[PDB]
Amino acid sequence: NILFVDDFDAKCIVPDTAIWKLCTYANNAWSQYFRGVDGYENVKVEEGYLKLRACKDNGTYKNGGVFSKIGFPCGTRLEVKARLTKLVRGGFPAIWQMPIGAPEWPRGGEIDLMEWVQGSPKQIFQTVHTFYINGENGSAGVTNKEADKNFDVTKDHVYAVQRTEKELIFYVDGKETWKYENQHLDKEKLQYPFCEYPFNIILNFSLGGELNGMMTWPGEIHDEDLPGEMWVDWVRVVLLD
Template sequence: MLSMLLTAALATVDPAPAGHVLAWADEFEADGLPDASKWTYDTHANRTGWYNEEAQYYAAARPENARIEDGVLIIEARRETMDPAPADWGGQAYTSARMVSTAAWDEGFIEARAKLPCGRGTWPAIWMLPRDASDWPAGGEIDIMEHVGHRPGVVHASIHTEAYNHVKGTQSTATIETPDACTAFHRYQVRWTPDEIVFLVDDAPYHRFANDGTGNSATWPFDKPFHLILNIAVGGFWGGAEGIDDAALPQRMEVDYVRVYQPAD
């Protein structure tokens, strides 16, 4: 019965990219908290302070920050009204959520259909880190979509490795103009093979990072499983470069679905 239900559910999904089959998906169909079998919450730096000078507290299983409504996952960044902020929130005045897939992959075609927040100070991302991300940037990072609220409609894709990363100013990155990114849903995608990583919006490629074939993990660490991450940061050296507009909060990223396709062979 379970296999019949799964087959019926997958039959409603758009056709897979050529040469791929659907391997994992979340269509966010059941209202309430996200499916705990598919998503966990990254909260580990709440006490010590988040990277990049970010200002948010990342909550776990808090519906104000992550919930499913009417078939859409909502990740919501909020300016909390409590002053001072509770100590168990790390003293942060802002809350949000950082969701991490329980599954991980080492190649494939991965896409999330999403509508982005545009409030100044917001920094939403759809991205990937390896299972053990403690050795960043040596372990690698795949940024499928980043967007900062003070540059509405400009979508970024980036790769970070030991040799190519933003600390050194050597990251491999590109942008694409998506003027209605905050008012309409778009498909943010990555096609990852052993030879290259290609970034797309709505099937249109705009950035490519090639494996140089040297076998050097400093330039190509993308030969191990990576988790998918969905989050909205608040502030930070990039997201907060022009300040945080408290009056614009709360802001939400809405995700219609996430789908992971694997090579058919």
């Protein structure tokens, strides 16, 4: 039972303009290099892929990224098939979900299906953020510490999360990796916001380096590794029985 699918196979050179919006600048690790990105110069649909490019164009770092204007209810599973063309040191690709119409981050939560950093290059990270975990200042969230440490992100993999009232279940390649569970605390504690808001889909290949002279988690950008691309074959949202 398919609620939403984009196979990026439309007769169009950009992703569906009603569904997908270009990521915009903000002063954070994932967003800083959307600044001065001219329209779709780092985003295209080609040969059945959404291709998100990270590059340096005349000394300016530029990220490739879109987010969905639509969001999805609980009782659903998101599956995203993607690969990186190349390992890029300082590269910071991600597949993730934000609440639509939540209060300020992280009070509505955040679900990361995939993040990659050079600091652990044979891994991907799957992570959850809430106000209960992060409070006002925290950014680490709760990550799968037992994540696969012999993993090649440059091959096609299906990254997935199943979201119910009870829990988030993470998968890689159809194999359960971990669960983040509803603790059923007073809603006041903001421990499990994941079913109060529709959640969207965010697909990006960002660049790290320093943010206001502090080294970001993805670490030092090696310009010799650029350009790089994340190729998304498809995204789908399945409605559970």
